[PDB]
Write an enzyme that holds these catalytic residues in place. Sequence first.
Site, PDB file in Angstrom:
ATOM      1  N   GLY A 117      -9.180   8.167  -3.051  1.00 14.33           N
ATOM      2  CA  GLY A 117      -9.826   9.455  -3.081  1.00 14.33           C
ATOM      3  C   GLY A 117     -10.447   9.770  -1.759  1.00 14.33           C
ATOM      4  O   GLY A 117     -10.044   9.207  -0.737  1.00 14.33           O
TER       5      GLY A 117
ATOM      6  N   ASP B 165       1.779   7.432   1.636  1.00 14.87           N
ATOM      7  CA  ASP B 165       2.217   8.637   0.917  1.00 14.87           C
ATOM      8  C   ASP B 165       3.397   9.220   1.662  1.00 14.87           C
ATOM      9  O   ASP B 165       3.301  10.261   2.296  1.00 14.87           O
ATOM     10  CB  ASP B 165       1.083   9.672   0.865  1.00 14.87           C
ATOM     11  CG  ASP B 165      -0.146   9.171   0.127  1.00 14.87           C
ATOM     12  OD1 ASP B 165      -0.241   9.297  -1.113  1.00 14.87           O
ATOM     13  OD2 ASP B 165      -1.066   8.670   0.786  1.00 14.87           O
TER      14      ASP B 165
ATOM     15  N   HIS C  21       1.288   5.014  -2.615  1.00 19.31           N
ATOM     16  CA  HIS C  21       0.893   5.780  -3.812  1.00 19.31           C
ATOM     17  C   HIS C  21       2.104   6.391  -4.503  1.00 19.31           C
ATOM     18  O   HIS C  21       2.882   7.123  -3.875  1.00 19.31           O
ATOM     19  CB  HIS C  21      -0.045   6.871  -3.409  1.00 19.31           C
ATOM     20  CG  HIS C  21      -1.373   6.392  -2.942  1.00 19.31           C
ATOM     21  ND1 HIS C  21      -2.458   6.324  -3.780  1.00 19.31           N
ATOM     22  CD2 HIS C  21      -1.825   6.061  -1.715  1.00 19.31           C
ATOM     23  CE1 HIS C  21      -3.530   5.988  -3.091  1.00 19.31           C
ATOM     24  NE2 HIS C  21      -3.176   5.828  -1.829  1.00 19.31           N
TER      25      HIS C  21
ATOM     26  N   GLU D 160     -11.018   4.006   6.617  1.00 18.01           N
ATOM     27  CA  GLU D 160      -9.934   4.753   7.225  1.00 18.01           C
ATOM     28  C   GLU D 160     -10.623   5.849   8.026  1.00 18.01           C
ATOM     29  O   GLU D 160     -10.312   6.067   9.209  1.00 18.01           O
ATOM     30  CB  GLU D 160      -9.015   5.313   6.159  1.00 18.01           C
ATOM     31  CG  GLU D 160      -9.254   6.752   5.789  1.00 18.01           C
ATOM     32  CD  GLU D 160      -7.970   7.419   5.337  1.00 18.01           C
ATOM     33  OE1 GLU D 160      -7.633   7.300   4.115  1.00 18.01           O
ATOM     34  OE2 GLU D 160      -7.308   8.025   6.220  1.00 18.01           O
TER      35      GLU D 160
ATOM     36  N   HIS E 283      -9.839   1.157  -0.818  1.00 23.23           N
ATOM     37  CA  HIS E 283      -9.544   1.978   0.369  1.00 23.23           C
ATOM     38  C   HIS E 283     -10.895   2.058   1.071  1.00 23.23           C
ATOM     39  O   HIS E 283     -11.912   2.421   0.431  1.00 23.23           O
ATOM     40  CB  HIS E 283      -9.182   3.405  -0.046  1.00 23.23           C
ATOM     41  CG  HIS E 283      -7.748   3.628  -0.401  1.00 23.23           C
ATOM     42  ND1 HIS E 283      -7.236   3.334  -1.648  1.00 23.23           N
ATOM     43  CD2 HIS E 283      -6.767   4.291   0.266  1.00 23.23           C
ATOM     44  CE1 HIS E 283      -6.007   3.827  -1.735  1.00 23.23           C
ATOM     45  NE2 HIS E 283      -5.701   4.424  -0.591  1.00 23.23           N
TER      46      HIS E 283
ATOM     47  N   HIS F 120       0.750  -1.257   0.000  1.00 22.36           N
ATOM     48  CA  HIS F 120       0.000   0.000   0.000  1.00 22.36           C
ATOM     49  C   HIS F 120       0.789   1.321   0.000  1.00 22.36           C
ATOM     50  O   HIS F 120       1.052   1.887   1.048  1.00 22.36           O
ATOM     51  CB  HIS F 120      -0.946  -0.001   1.181  1.00 22.36           C
ATOM     52  CG  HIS F 120      -2.063   0.972   1.043  1.00 22.36           C
ATOM     53  ND1 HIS F 120      -3.372   0.580   0.883  1.00 22.36           N
ATOM     54  CD2 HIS F 120      -2.075   2.320   1.095  1.00 22.36           C
ATOM     55  CE1 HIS F 120      -4.148   1.640   0.853  1.00 22.36           C
ATOM     56  NE2 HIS F 120      -3.387   2.712   0.989  1.00 22.36           N
TER      57      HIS F 120
HETATM   58  O1  LIG Z   1      -2.509   7.834  -5.848  1.00 21.36           O
HETATM   59  C1  LIG Z   1      -3.847   7.975  -6.377  1.00 21.36           C
HETATM   60  C2  LIG Z   1      -4.634   8.975  -5.536  1.00 21.36           C
HETATM   61  O2  LIG Z   1      -5.146   8.317  -4.441  1.00 21.36           O
HETATM   62  C3  LIG Z   1      -5.377   9.283  -3.444  1.00 21.36           C
HETATM   63  N1  LIG Z   1      -4.749   8.916  -2.205  1.00 21.36           N
HETATM   64  C4  LIG Z   1      -3.451   9.057  -1.904  1.00 21.36           C
HETATM   65  N2  LIG Z   1      -3.301   8.884  -0.593  1.00 21.36           N
HETATM   66  C5  LIG Z   1      -4.520   8.601  -0.076  1.00 21.36           C
HETATM   67  C6  LIG Z   1      -4.965   8.317   1.239  1.00 21.36           C
HETATM   68  N3  LIG Z   1      -6.329   8.067   1.409  1.00 21.36           N
HETATM   69  C7  LIG Z   1      -7.165   8.095   0.385  1.00 21.36           C
HETATM   70  N4  LIG Z   1      -6.735   8.355  -0.837  1.00 21.36           N
HETATM   71  C8  LIG Z   1      -5.409   8.606  -1.068  1.00 21.36           C
HETATM   72  C9  LIG Z   1      -4.712  10.596  -3.955  1.00 21.36           C
HETATM   73  O3  LIG Z   1      -5.719  11.509  -4.410  1.00 21.36           O
HETATM   74  C10 LIG Z   1      -3.722  10.242  -5.089  1.00 21.36           C
HETATM   75  O4  LIG Z   1      -3.689  11.253  -6.107  1.00 21.36           O
HETATM   76 ZN   LIG Z   2      -3.723   4.857   0.174  1.00 17.33          ZN
END
Ligand SMILES: OC[C@H]1O[C@@H](n2c[nH+]c3cncnc32)[C@H](O)[C@@H]1O
Ligand SMILES: [Zn+2]
EC number: 3.5.4.4
Length: 349
Positions: free
Chosen positions: A181, A293, A14, A214, A211, A12
Amino acid sequence: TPAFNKPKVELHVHLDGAIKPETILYFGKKRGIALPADTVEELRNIIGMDKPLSLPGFLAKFDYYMPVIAGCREAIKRIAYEFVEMKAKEGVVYVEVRYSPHLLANSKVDPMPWNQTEGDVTPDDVVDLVNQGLQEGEQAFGIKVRSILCCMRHQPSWSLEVLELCKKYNQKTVVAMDLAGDETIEGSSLFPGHVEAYEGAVKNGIHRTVHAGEVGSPEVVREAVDILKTERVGEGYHTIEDEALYNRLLKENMHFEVCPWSSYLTGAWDPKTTHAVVRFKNDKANYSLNTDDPLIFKSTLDTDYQMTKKDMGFTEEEFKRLNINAAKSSFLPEEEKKELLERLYREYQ
Ligand SMILES: OC[C@H]1O[C@@H](n2c[nH+]c3cncnc32)[C@H](O)[C@@H]1O
Ligand SMILES: [Zn+2]
């Protein structure tokens, strides 16, 4: 002194959330696109966050830098490549990176992300560029990397295409489809585009992660699992609030893709309450420890390991166990999956 200095598996993270401040700086200058700062250090203090915010507030951090990457072929491949490198150094032997191909395109996408001027980088082109970077990176740092294409809660109109991109690039790095998202967008889980996309994932044998839970409630998780047929739950911390559901997921051996640091920084997790991963460890649940992230959380894979170690009582034994489960729960084909397990056991000796 790392918390767990042994091979790891990350399911997990991004790609657009794991970019080097120096690469962001490089392309802003290079393309003459503005950035909220012109120093990696101040670039990190703006994009970065050291205090809980919210999911909607956290997601806005992408607005600062995505514009300098999106639409730039050189940049899309570069970040993909440098991503493997970042993982190789963290001791990750296998990783699945996720991202929205649409949010990095500047052609054949509506609504045009980031108010971009039309161009030739189509969403498909993005998958191809990332595949290439990821491949060149595997090759060069010697770790196995796969990718996951994200459907965006807010833009269901893109979902059915994401499915097509997964079908086309099946195992040509693309091993699954996600739904990322803003989880707070009421009903986003149930939008037709999303639902129809997962229905087709199920029908076409395309893996599925979602997702959920959360910040959303048990019902968002229930919908991911029951309606979307998700094979893994992205985070899913709130599932434990529905003992019945939790136990049924515990029974199916559902994999929960946990991100500790991220849950704190997004206000998903009340720092006064015990982390759901403590319950997971205790119930011997199927779960991985992930970064999510790292650019925005200003962290590394060790950050989440130190957190669990220091604050949640995790041992090398749980560390080894969770990673063996992350391996079993990966979207790798049988053979490669066995090869992964083989390597972990070899090295865990
Ligand atoms: O990486 C794809 C997209 O997933 C979303 N994303 C990234 N970190 C996240 C945490 N939680 C939900 N969505 C997330 C962001 O808008 C990013 O542009
Ligand atoms: Zn995520």
